[PDB]
Amino acid sequence: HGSVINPATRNYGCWLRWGHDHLNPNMQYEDPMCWQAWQDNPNAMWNWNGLYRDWVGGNHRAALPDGQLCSGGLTEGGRYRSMDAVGPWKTTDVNNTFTIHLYDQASHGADYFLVYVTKQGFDPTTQPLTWDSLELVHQTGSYPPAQNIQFTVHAPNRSGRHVVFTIWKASHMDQTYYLCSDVNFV
Ligand SMILES: [Cu+2]
């Protein structure tokens, strides 16, 4: 159980920024995407480390229909479905070369990570996330059990607002985490 801490995923960030003030009506105006998320299902944030599927068998495309990538294909009864929403999600500023930092409290290890980034021209404020919209920019091999895992990726030919989609395949069983992070390539 865990998530990408940097660049923070959607639900981790929503928890981090608003967990201490989750019913604040001004969230609507300060962080509208976090607002809609908290409105829909507070557990998307309280259980921020739980965005996984079991028994995907490597078939990520089958498990995650277009427009449901960020929710893990509506995993856990749609718990994270608000992650699929379209709009001005808060971004982390990154360079074209950036570090992914995963935290996993259970130290499951990883068989691999896949890192996809949206193509130039994609607009996350108006368009749902699709497999077409993403290109694979990084692939790792396995990592031993550890609470913190990090590695550097390069996402070429990108500028401004994008989505980084990280697939983390745990080593303890066929459990796969699906981690969307909003970024701004500066
Ligand atoms: Cu776990």
Side-chain angles (χ1 to χ4, degrees), residues 133-145:
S133 73
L134 288 175
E135 282 175 338
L136 178 65
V137 299
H138 201 86
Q139 168 203 346
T140 76
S142 60
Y143 283 80

Side-chain angles (χ1 to χ4, degrees), residues 1 106 108 175 177:
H1 290 20
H108 293 311
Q175 178 165 97
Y177 295 77

Side-chain angles (χ1 to χ4, degrees), residues 13-23 27 38 45-46:
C14 280
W15 176 78
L16 199 63
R17 301 187 299 278
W18 297 100
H20 70 287
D21 197 15
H22 83 277
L23 294 172
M27 195 191 309
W38 280 102
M45 276 60 66
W46 303 131

Side-chain angles (χ1 to χ4, degrees), residues 1-2 49 52 104-108 168 170 172 175 177:
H1 290 20
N49 63 352
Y52 66 86
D104 169 18
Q105 211 271 343
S107 308
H108 293 311
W168 159 39
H172 64 306
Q175 178 165 97
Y177 295 77

Side-chain angles (χ1 to χ4, degrees), residues 32-52:
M33 304 307 295
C34 286
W35 165 68
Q36 62 89 37
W38 280 102
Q39 180 191 67
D40 177 76
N41 197 331
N43 297 314
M45 276 60 66
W46 303 131
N47 300 313
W48 58 262
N49 63 352
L51 213 170
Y52 66 86

